[PDB]
């Protein structure tokens, strides 16, 4: 289940870009992305580009093709995303034992989740995105559910090694308790469609309009998935943002208010999966280089408490007085 990190020299990359007539220009300067290896490069006219080498063992060609399609179609319906460039046939090039694609370096500033106006513009395009995304469902890419997000990680956690011994028990207990709670609130009672899959401020840029970047995680799931991670602030601030992005979102796609109940389970889901995600990629130098703590107890104690806390959010607090408003 754990990846066997295979290095990729910047030279082996130039060969790849050569084998496909992709004339570079000057230097193959690297950008930082944990999942896949991305490098930027100008063209004979100095118009910036980026090569993305999909990390082996993660996605299959049939899966990368599905997003390449999605991205390409999304462009057709006028949604702020950069589709991969085509090279005399397809978009999914492959040099040596690595697949890769080239995308038009987008550029732009940092999206401000603060500005309620940008929120609306993002919520609105997100509505046109899901409008497209609903036309058909991935067949090879995952479709968000408990298997990949909960049960698989728990299995890794078992034979982890990276979890401090005797502290693991409590942790695995807090986990089980969490997956029981999320499972009890999960439901196949919602609409599924092609999602951005990782829609949060980080993967959104702004140059007079929002621009979504990185569909590597595009998965089949509930519309809410691309909306809950946007909220920020105090309870009341999030009450209006949610209320606001839906009013804009609904211009192109109706939103099912009931999906708002799936948020705590999704957050719980992203929480437990993220631990396996890091763990599985541990042989990659970059992960012990940035997540050094992953090894200490402090971290696994805090995590244990975070899980225990999440299950309480998923259950009615025995307040009882029942103060309305």
């Amino acid at each position: 289940s754990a990846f066997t990190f295979q290095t990729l020299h910047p030279d082996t990359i130039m060969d790849a870009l050569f084998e496909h007539g992709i004339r570079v220009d000057s230097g193959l300067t690297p950008l930082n992305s944990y999942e896949n290896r991305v490098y930027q490069f100008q063209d004979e006219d100095r118009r910036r580009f980026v090569v993305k080498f999909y990390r082996p063992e993660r996605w299959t060609a049939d899966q990368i093709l599905e997003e390449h399609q999605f991205a390409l179609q999304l462009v057709n319906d006028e949604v702020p995303v950069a589709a991969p460039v085509a090279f005399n046939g397809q978009t999914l090039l492959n040099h040596q034992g690595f697949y890769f694609a080239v995308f038009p370096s987008v550029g732009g500033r940092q999206f401000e989740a603060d500005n309620i106006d940008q929120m609306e513009a993002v919520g609105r395009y997100l509505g046109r995105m899901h409008q497209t995304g609903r036309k058909q469902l991935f067949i090879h890419r995952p479709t968000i559910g408990l298997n990949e997000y909960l049960i698989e990680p728990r299995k890794l956690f078992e034979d982890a090694t990276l979890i401090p011994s005797g502290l693991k028990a409590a942790f695995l207990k807090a986990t089980d308790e969490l997956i029981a709670a999320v499972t009890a609130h999960w439901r196949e009672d919602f609409t599924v469609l092609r999602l951005h899959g990782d829609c949060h401020a980080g993967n959104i840029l702004w140059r007079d309009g929002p621009m979504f970047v990185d569909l590597d995680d595009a998965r089949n799931g509930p519309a809410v998935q691309d909306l809950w991670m946007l909220l920020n602030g105090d309870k009341a601030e999030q009450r209006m943002q949610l209320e606001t992005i839906i009013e804009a979102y609904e211009e192109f796609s109706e939103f099912d208010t009931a999906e708002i109940g799936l948020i705590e389970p999704l957050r719980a889901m992203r929480l437990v999966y993220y631990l396996a995600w890091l763990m599985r990629r541990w042989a990659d130098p970059a992960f012990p280089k940035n997540f050094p703590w992953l090894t200490g107890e402090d971290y696994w104690l805090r995590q244990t408490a975070t899980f225990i806390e999440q299950a309480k959010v998923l259950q009615e607090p025995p307040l009882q007085l029942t103060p309305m408003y």
Side-chain angles (χ1 to χ4, degrees), residues 170-314:
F171 166 92
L172 297 190
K173 188 180 185 292
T175 290
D176 293 353
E177 265 152 33
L178 189 56
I179 90 88
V182 42
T183 40
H185 300 284
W186 194 233
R187 61 192 180 68
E188 247 62 296
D189 188 46
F190 64 85
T191 299
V192 330
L193 61 159
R194 275 132 72 201
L195 304 165
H196 171 81
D198 188 7
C199 187
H200 68 81
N203 296 305
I204 193 289
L205 291 161
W206 179 286
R207 210 212 309 81
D208 282 294
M211 298 178 294
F212 304 85
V213 293
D214 210 335
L215 298 203
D216 193 28
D217 272 324
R219 222 160 297 219
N220 292 320
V224 258
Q225 233 309 283
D226 293 340
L227 294 184
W228 76 271
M229 285 182 283
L230 291 175
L231 319 199
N232 63 293
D234 75 354
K235 297 109 297 163
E237 239 286 60
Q238 304 200 188
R239 176 190 173 185
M240 76 133 272
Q241 309 177 331
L242 183 49
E243 192 166 341
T244 290
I245 79 91
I246 305 177
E247 186 63 6
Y249 179 98
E250 301 218 303
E251 171 182 351
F252 301 102
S253 284
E254 188 186 355
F255 182 58
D256 227 73
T257 321
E259 297 185 29
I260 302 297
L262 311 171
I263 60 170
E264 296 311 325
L266 290 176
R267 172 184 283 127
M269 283 172 221
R270 178 188 255 275
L271 237 48
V272 45
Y273 179 71
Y274 172 93
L275 258 59
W277 181 81
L278 285 165
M279 301 183 87
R280 284 163 191 161
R281 300 163 161 60
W282 201 238
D284 181 315
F287 289 67
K289 216 300 181 186
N290 296 286
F291 314 96
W293 16 277
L294 219 298
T295 255
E297 313 179 273
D298 291 65
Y299 180 78
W300 291 93
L301 290 184
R302 298 202 210 72
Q303 211 65 50
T304 299
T306 282
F307 287 3
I308 286 187
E309 241 316 306
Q310 261 297 298
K312 293 178 182 170
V313 176
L314 293 151

Side-chain angles (χ1 to χ4, degrees), residues 89-104:
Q90 73 297 157
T91 43
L92 219 209
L93 312 334
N94 165 67
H95 183 36
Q96 233 48 285
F98 297 59
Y99 285 107
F100 64 116
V102 188
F103 303 75

Side-chain angles (χ1 to χ4, degrees), residues 113-151:
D114 250 354
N115 176 296
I116 311 170
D117 230 64
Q118 290 188 169
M119 200 87 82
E120 287 191 303
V122 160
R124 180 180 143 291
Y125 271 146
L126 229 31
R128 183 184 290 180
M129 198 202 282
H130 291 192
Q131 187 184 195
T132 301
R134 53 170 38 79
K135 295 178 183 177
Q136 38 182 157
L137 268 19
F138 290 135
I139 289 178
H140 295 303
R141 302 212 133 227
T143 144
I144 289 184
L146 311 192
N147 171 234
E148 181 186 21
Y149 279 78
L150 302 183
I151 63 178

